Each structure stands twice: as structure tokens, then as C-alpha cells.
């Protein structure tokens, strides 16, 4: 009938029915499980599969109005059916598309900022045609979203997949990201995690600048053709330099980070249609930068240097110096964004926000797909309320899937 | 053929084959899923099910020797078969039992201290018969394990389930635990989480002492008879008073905690046999006390008071005061145990230990059942290496299962 969900922090009990609308050794801590990956195609969607999903979506959309529009609903259902018989696919009204993007966001089990789901700017680039036009669209997005520090969530929808042989794809994981260099002296400079992709950019012509914070170029693929490299205009990239409210030596660390967190390589699945190119963004949550970017050993790995600067016993694990360090780094991050007037949210505030939202979600539609493993911040887990909340993780539709890294499935022309 | 497992911190790849030997909406963050709970019975184990499992276990046991003892192996296999036809069950040699307890530990997906798996003291109480004898056995365990601060892991195995109507059961979750009182003024005193169980003890005759740290009594059930209450001799309970290495006011908080972490209510399943009563213990990991016991809002909830004592902006979430506080509490815990010479391990050291162990496990037997959600410490998640490790969670055998709270399935005499 329904699944029982408990919050061991408040004793609160919830009944999840929503999971019934889901799609598909316990593969728990798997980053990219096949279940979350929507791969390629070389043939249109079998009409037998498409129409059902289409009908399905159209019904969801029309059922979403406080006061139904049955005439339009039926008309639309017909219009779409007829459109598929005659063309073998179909086009969403801008409204449906808008609705689709917010719901897909609403259904992201791994997103903690979903209380903002209804607040999204949608850029319709479905009529796009060249890499250059893609690049221009992306720039418009970046400029709009950055909003000079007062960040705004937005998404840019490019042409939907047709036959699977003319896919629009951004080869970058994020719109804004730093390059990683394997120096001569054997050391790594910049973002150790982007070493390969940085090399690719070079291989495609991009000129490496060997800096610690060089913004990588956009590698765009349009109409399924080979990817073209485009440097992002520097004026468009807002950055925050890191300062600590108390340790003046913190700035001596010479760190900074971009203000725009934009996911660039995911596919939007909606009513049977697939959009291989739909970059989107929200605003940063402090821990992403202060903890993951700066403290992961396979990224900027600055934890020990900050430890020493603080005079901690960096040689004694049980001294808990790592916990002391990372917190000061987190404080610097938050302090700097605030000082420079760039939207950002701390993880504590983020957690309570999500709890409020999940609460809203169960009341509203009897569920909220949640991936505990991703929703719990990388530091101070049980100090946040999300940690004590049991969660159900399932895949609804619309949905935002991962895709196979393009350079792995692209037939070069 | 095998599952692929990745460590995004080191790029390391592992192949899990062990999962093939496993037994049985994604029920991820569920504390007590049915899959981990081995419930009651009112009839012996169907011989058709028992023998296969028995044969199975005996083969594992004998295959564990560096140099096989095939004669004994076959003899034992026969001895056991014949023993079941004639009695409808069987007895493990002390050795097998010992082997069984370490393997079950070895197979606990939620245990981070498993690198210590082969170091376990086994107390054979399978011939026990009365609650009083149970109580004495438990005391011996407590005394031995406490070892005056130099904690020793140990387990006490009581009589295996026969027909399911004569179950030996400890009604307590842990051997040592504090009571919780609903005061007249409406406030809670002690461990808010043990309110109900404290009431039960009272209901069964125990005299409430209304203290903040009153050790609850043992509530023992023997041969399936009604539970008897036994106070634990105070001399047997070692405790650590909390002091901070720098904040002298910390001790003014008047906190302490028991040194022995002993799980009392789990069932040991081995070769078809079930042991409803097998309390066991290891030693504490700092975060259990400093974070969960002291900082969970539904437990001692001391986070805000420590925040104020430190002079932090306890009114501004984004100030990250909670992170500053909990760390100092964690430091106090570790500092106090060390000062008082009571074994304890910090979570950072614990994490590296487990990683080393998991490494050993994949090499040794091609796998290691791990529950990421439980293995990652309640604070500084990604600062520990366990966070960046993909893990497979499955149920092998021997295994330690949860059981239905006894007071829910007991027919009072
Ligand atoms: C408005 C502010 C927003 C905040 C603060 C927020 C925060 C977060 C955080 C902290 C993550 C973790 C990412 C990681 O660990 O790699 C995340 C993931 C995610 N968010 Fe949000 N988000 C916001 C807006 C959005 C928007 C506008 C969308 C979509 C239109 C969205 C879609 C997702 C998805 C799909 C993921 C999963 C990414 C992945 O699996 O790699 N988020 N978000
Ligand atoms: C030698 C030191 C040991 C350490 C430091 C260690 C540490 C831990 C920790 C931190 C937990 C988390 C408990 C919770 O969050 O509630 C745990 C759980 C567990 N440990 Fe260990 N452990 C040790 C020994 C043992 C021994 C001797 C056994 C069995 C003979 C064992 C069996 C388990 C089991 C089954 C759980 C799961 C408990 C549950 O699900 O409630 N551990 N251990
Ligand atoms: C396969 C084609 C099936 C067509 C059936 C359409 C039934 C109309 O469905 C209606 O949509 C309304 C939204 O406007 C809702 O308010 C109604 O509750 C719902 O019954
Ligand atoms: C149902 C009864 C089946 C009995 C078959 C027993 C086969 C013996 O099994 C043997 O056990 C040894 C351990 O001493 C191992 O070293 C051997 O590799 C293994 O083949
Ligand atoms: C490893 C570099 O990471 C990034 O560039 N990131 C981190 C992962 C993503 N983070 C996000 C995304 C969104 Cl849409 C909102 C908040 N944070 C995008 C930005
Ligand atoms: C809520 C009170 O918690 C406890 O009494 N605990 C916490 C849970 C258990 N912790 C353990 C158990 C073992 Cl066997 C080893 C280390 N820690 C037993 C002690
Ligand atoms: C292996 C493990 O799943 C992985 O390293 C983690 C876990 N949870 C996460 N949570 C978030 N938000 N982001 C991440 O990248 C990860 N990665
Ligand atoms: C709901 C959630 O699973 C639960 O609160 C957590 C998660 N992980 C845990 N991890 C450990 N070690 N111990 C716990 O009690 C819990 N509880």
C-alpha cells in the first residue's frame, strides 16, 4: 500500500506512496550506476514506447492545474498522438518544457536545493543548429545566471535527440571548471581531477596557460558533429578570492573559486523525449568548495598546509587537526562569498531547507525521491537533520540522467 | 562474473566476487530493514533447511585450514548428519563456535572495526539454564572486557534456539546504558532515548534513581521464561569523566560515559543454528560518544550549551558554530579516555584501519560486505577515506541479525 519512513531525530513517521510511480549485492555507494545513466541511440524511439510515455506526460502536465482544462487536455492529447503518427516524435509547448525542467529537478534524488524547484529560468534553445550558436546560448546563460553575484538558477534546453546520430552535447562536466596540468617537474598544477579533459582540450587546439586556476574552454558538439573548442570570455566568469575572517595568512594561500556551479553534461528525459544537452545551475553550498574542491586529496588537497598554518599537530591523527582545519576553510569560503556579495548557502541551513521541502513533498504528492548518501553533507553529518531521516530513493519521470562520457562513444567525422 | 568497485580517492579498482555467496523503491537509509532482522519461531528448523546449511558451514570451517584435515572433515560431516537425524539439530564444537563468531563479525557490513575480527574472546555459556546464571555470565564478560581500561573484545554465547519457545534473550540494547526520566517539571533527565525501556525496568521492579547517568539494570530472559531484573554491580562499570585539554569549564558540564560498548540484543546465525542471546563488545570510537551520544538532539543534546560556553554566535547557523563545538566535544572525549587510560580510537584512525582491512579482505576472499551509510563517521565524512570508497553491501553467513524487540513478541507467563 505504501512504504513507512522514519525520522529518528523527531520520531516523525511518513508514508511513501509516490514510489509506486517509479520506473525500473546492493549497489549502494556507486557513483554512476547504470540505473541513473541514459545512454546513446542510432534509431528513433520505437513509437510503441514513445506514445505511451507521451500520453503519460501530457496527463501529468494537465493534471497539474488547480482548475483543469479538459478541453485543451483532450485536444492536446490528440494533437500529440497525431503529431507522432505523422512525424514519429513531437515538440513540447514551451510551457510543458518549463514544467518538465522543474519536475525533473523536483525528481533529482541527489539534489539538496530542491526547495527552490519552482524557481527556474528556462532558455529555449531547441532551435539551435551550430556549435557557435550553442556557444552564444551558453554565454547568455552564464551571464544571466551569474547576475553579478546575485546568482539565479537557470537551464538551457538544446534540441531533443532525434535519431541519436545528431546529438547536441557539452563535453564538459561543468560550464565553469579549472584545468589540471602535469608539470615537467612531475608535479600537478591546478585541478588534479581534470587532467585528462585538460589534455583533450589541448589536443583539440586549446592553448594551455599552466596556471593554478585556468578556466577550461567549452567543448561543444552540435547536430552530432565533432566537438569544437570555445574559450569562455573572462568577463563572464565571476570568481571569489578566499580570505579568512581572522587568519590574515589565509589569503597568502592565494586561493579563489568560480561563483557559478553549473552541471553541463546531463540528459533530460521527459515524456519519451530525450535532451542530451541541457546545462543548468543553482548556487553553491559552502561545503562543495571548502570541503570537496579544497580538501579532497585528489583535488586541490590543501588540508595539511592549512593545518600547519594553524599550528596544529598535523602529525597526530587523533589530535583531530583535520576537523579543525576543514572548518576554518569552510568558514573562509562562506566569509569570502558573503564579503564579495556572491550567493552561497552553508550546509546547515541547506539541510533544514531540504527537510522543510521533503515535508512539503510528502504532504503534496506523498513522496520525495532522496539519495541519503548524496544529501548528507561531506562534514558534520549527524549534526544536520538530514542524517537522521530515513529516505526512499527511486527514479520517476521527468528525470535528469547521467550519460556515457561522449569521447567514449563518438565516431569522429 | 564479478562486480567492479572503485575508490575515487585513489582510482583503485576492485572486483567483488564474494557477493555471489550472499543470501536473499531502494530501501537505503532504513535503520532496521527486514533483510537484517531474524525473527522468532515456535517450531524447530525444518530439517530440509537445516542440514544443507549445516553441511555448508562445516565445509566452510574445514576449508579454512591452511592444511586440510579431510579425514576429520568427512567424519565431522557424517557426525553432524547423523546427529541431526537422531536429534533434529546439533552442537558446534567450541572451535566451530569460535570460528563462527569471528566470521559473523567479519561479515557485519556495518562494523568499522573489523580489522580486529580474528582477535576475539569467546565465552561458552551454551549450557546456561537460569536468568541468574545468565547474569553471572554477563558479569564475567563485563569484568573481562573492561580489563580495567585496557578493553578487550569478547562475546558470550548462550544456548542456541531450539523450538523457538525457550529463547535466551537480553532485553537491553546494550550491556551498559543510562536511564532516561520524564521529570515532574516535564523535563527529561538522563538519556532521552531510553525513556520507554527505563519505564519497563521500573514496571518490573527496578528502583529509579532519577540521576543523569544511572546505569540501567540487565533484564534477562532464560529458557523463554519471563524476564528478570538484575542491577549491575557498580564496581563492574568503569566510567570516564569528561575534561577538555584547554577549556577548564568543560568539566563544569559534569559529563561522563561508560567505557564498555557492548551490543546485547543481536542474534548469531550460523550453519542453520540461531543464537538469540550473544552479547559482544569491542572498544569505543570517539565519535559515538562525542557526536551521537552528546550531540544528537534526541539524546544528551549538549551542542548549544557548549556553543555558548565557547562564546560562539549560536544564533547564526552560517557561522558554523555547530562544527566548532562538536569538534571540541570530540577532543574532550578522546582526551579524557586517553588521560584515564581507557582504550578508544578516533574516527580518522578508525577509517584508515578499515580501508587497510577491506584491502586485506578483497585480496583474501574477493570481497567485503560494507554498508557505506554506517561506515562513514557522523562528522568529517569526506575527510576520511571510507567516504570515497564504493562499497557492496550483502548478507553472508555466519551473520549477526537484529531481532524483533522482545517485549513485542513475548507471551507473558
Ligand atoms: C538553487 C540552488 C541549488 C542548490 C544550492 C543545489 C545544491 C546541490 C548540491 C550541493 C549538489 C551536490 C553536487 C555534488 O556533490 O556533486 C546538487 C546536485 C544536483 N542538483 Fe542541485 N542545487 C540547486 C539547484 C539545482 C537546479 C537549478 C537543478 C536543476 C535544474 C539542480 C539539479 C541537481 C542534480 C541533477 C544534481 C545531481 C548532480 C549529479 O548527480 O552529479 N540543482 N545540488
Ligand atoms: C574491537 C573494536 C571494535 C570497534 C572499534 C568497532 C566499532 C564499531 C562502530 C563505530 C559501530 C557503529 C555502531 C553504531 O553506530 O550504533 C559498530 C557496529 C557494529 N559492530 Fe563493531 N567494533 C569493534 C568490535 C566489534 C566486535 C568484537 C563485534 C562482534 C563480535 C562487532 C560487531 C558489530 C556489529 C554487528 C555492528 C552493527 C551494530 C548495529 O547494527 O546496531 N564489532 N562497530
Ligand atoms: C490514452 C488516452 C487517455 C485519455 C484520457 C484523459 C482523461 C482526462 O483525465 C483528467 O485530466 C484532468 C486534468 O485536466 C484531471 O483533473 C482529471 O482528474 C483527470 O481525470
Ligand atoms: C553433501 C556432502 C558433501 C561432502 C563433500 C566434501 C568434499 C571435501 O571438500 C574439501 O574440503 C577440504 C578441507 O579440508 C578442502 O581443502 C578441499 O578443497 C575441498 O575439496
Ligand atoms: C569538481 C568541480 O565541481 C564543480 O564544478 N561543481 C560541483 C558539482 C556541481 N555543483 C552544484 C550544481 C548545482 Cl546545479 C547547484 C549547486 N552545486 C557543479 C559545480
Ligand atoms: C545509544 C547508546 O549507545 C551505546 O551504548 N553504544 C553505541 C552502539 C554500540 N557501539 C559499539 C559496539 C561495539 Cl561491539 C564496538 C564499538 N562501538 C554499543 C554502545
Ligand atoms: C563513493 C561515494 O558514493 C562517493 O565518493 C560520494 C558519496 N556521496 C556524495 N555526495 C555528494 N553530494 N557528492 C558526491 O560526489 C558524493 N560522492
Ligand atoms: C536514517 C539513517 O540511516 C540513520 O539515522 C543513521 C545512518 N548511519 C548510521 N551510522 C552509524 N554508524 N550508526 C547509526 O546509528 C547510523 N544511523
Can you describe this structure?
Two copies of one chain form a homodimer. Chain A has 413 residues and is of the alpha+beta class. The first copy, chain A, folds into three domains: 11-126 and 153-163 and 267-281 and 351-375, Nitric Oxide Synthase, Chain A, domain 1 (Alpha-Beta Complex); 127-152 and 167-238 and 402-406, Nitric Oxide Synthase,Heme Domain,Chain A domain 2 (Nitric Oxide Synthase,Heme Domain, Chain A, domain 2), CATH 3.90.440.10; 239-261 and 284-349, Bovine Endothelial Nitric Oxide Synthase Heme Domain, Chain: A,domain 3 (Alpha-Beta Complex). Helix content of chain A is 32%, strand content 13%. The first copy, chain A, contains ten helices and 18 strands. In chain A, a hairpin with a 6-residue loop joins β9 (218-221) and β10 (228-230). The first copy, chain A, is globular. One protoporphyrin IX containing FE binds next to α3 of chain B. The PDB classes it as oxidoreductase. Keywords: nitric oxide, NOS, tetrahydrobiopterin, Calmodulin-binding, FMN, Metal-binding, Zinc. It forms a dimeric assembly. Structure of murine INOS oxygenase domain with inhibitor AR-C132283.
Please give a quick description of this structure.
The first copy, chain A, is an alpha+beta fold and 413 residues long. The first copy, chain A, has helices spanning 47-63, 70-87, 94-106, 131-146, 195-203, 286-295, 303-309, 321-339, 347-365, 372-375; strands at 3-6, 13-16, 26-27, 121-124, 154-157, 169-170, 180-182, 188-190, 218-221, 228-230, 239-241, 256-258, 262-263, 267-270, 273-275, 280-281, 392-393, 399-401. Chains A and B meet through strand 3, helix 6, helix 8, helix 9 and strand 17 of A and strand 3, helix 6, helix 8, helix 9 and strand 17 of B.
Amino acid at each position: 500500500q505504501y512504504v513507512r519512513i522514519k525520522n529518528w531525530g523527531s520520531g516523525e513517521i511518513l508514508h511513501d506512496t509516490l514510489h509506486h510511480k517509479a520506473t525500473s549485492s546492493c549497489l549502494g555507494s556507486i557513483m554512476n550506476p547504470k540505473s541513473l545513466t541514459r545512454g546513446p541511440r542510432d534509431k528513433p524511439t520505437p513509437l510503441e514506447e514513445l506514445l505511451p510515455h507521451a500520453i503519460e506526460f501530457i496527463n501529468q502536465y494537465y493534471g497539474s492545474f488547480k482548475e483543469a482544462k479538459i478541453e485543451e487536455h483532450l485536444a492536446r492529447l490528440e494533437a500529440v498522438t497525431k503529431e507522432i503518427e505523422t512525424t514519429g516524435t513531437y515538440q513540447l509547448t514551451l510551457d510543458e518544457l518549463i514544467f518538465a525542467t522543474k519536475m525533473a529537478w523536483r525528481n533529482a534524488p541527489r539534489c539538496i536545493g530542491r526547495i527552490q524547484w519552482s524557481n527556474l529560468q528556462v532558455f529555449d534553445a531547441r532551435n539551435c543548429s551550430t556549435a557557435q550558436e550553442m556557444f552564444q546560448h551558453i554565454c547568455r546563460h552564464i551571464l544571466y545566471a551569474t547576475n553579478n553575484g546575485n546568482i539565479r538558477s537557470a537551464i538551457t534546453v538544446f534540441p531533443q535527440r532525434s535519431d541519436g546520430k545528431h546529438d547536441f552535447r557539452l563535453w564538459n562536466s561543468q560550464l565553469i571548471r579549472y584545468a589540471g596540468y602535469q608539470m615537467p617537474d612531475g608535479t600537478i598544477r591546478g585541478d588534479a581531477a581534470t587532467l585528462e579533459f585538460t589534455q583533450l582540450c589541448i589536443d583539440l587546439g586549446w592553448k594551455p596557460r599552466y596556471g593554478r586556476f585556468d578556466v577550461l574552454p567549452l567543448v561543444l558538439q552540435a547536430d552530432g558533429q565533432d566537438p569544437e573548442v570555445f574559450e569562455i570570455p573572462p568577463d563572464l566568469v565571476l570568481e571569489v578570492t578566499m580570505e579568512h575572517p581572522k587568519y590574515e595568512w589565509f589569503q597568502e594561500l592565494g586561493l579563489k573559486w568560480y561563483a557559478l556551479p553549473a552541471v553541463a553534461n546531463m540528459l533530460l528525459e521527459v515524456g519519451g523525449l530525450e535532451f542530451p544537452a541541457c546545462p543548468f545551475n543553482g548556487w553553491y553550498m559552502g561545503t562543495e568548495i571548502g570541503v570537496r574542491d579544497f580538501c579532497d586529496t585528489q583535488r586541490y588537497n590543501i588540508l595539511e598546509e592549512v593545518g600547519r598554518r594553524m599550528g596544529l599537530e598535523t602529525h597526530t591523527l587523533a589530535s583531530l587537526w583535520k576537523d579543525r582545519a576543514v572548518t576554518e576553510i569552510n568558514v573562509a569560503v562562506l566569509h569570502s562569498f558573503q564579503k564579495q556579495n556572491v550567493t552561497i548557502m552553508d550546509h546547515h541551513t541547506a539541510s533544514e531547507s531540504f527537510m522543510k521541502h521533503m515535508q512539503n513533498e510528502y504532504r503534496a504528492r506523498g513522496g520525495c525521491p532522496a539519495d541519503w548518501i548524496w544529501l548528507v553533507p561531506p562534514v558534520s553529518g549527524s549534526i544536520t537533520p538530514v542524517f537522521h531521516q530515513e529516505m526512499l530513493n527511486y527514479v520517476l519521470s521527468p528525470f535528469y540522467y547521467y550519460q556515457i562520457e561522449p569521447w567514449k562513444t563518438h565516431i569522429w567525422q
